[PDB]
């Protein structure tokens, strides 16, 4: 975690979000708000 950006491309794409979607997930969250938000909503939805 040294940056809510690569970390969370890598987190998610760890955990397998259908195939391309986290990477989506890349250009649409900018904001560190967004990108914990919108982090979460991936993670819990796929849980």
Request: glycine share 2%; hydrophobic share 45%; proline share 0%.
């Amino acid at each position: 975690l040294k940056n809510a950006x690569e970390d969370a491309i890598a987190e998610l794409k760890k955990a397998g979000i259908t195939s391309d979607f986290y990477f989506n997930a890349x250009n649409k969250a900018k904001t560190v708000e967004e990108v914990n938000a919108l982090x979460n909503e991936i993670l819990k939805a796929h849980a």
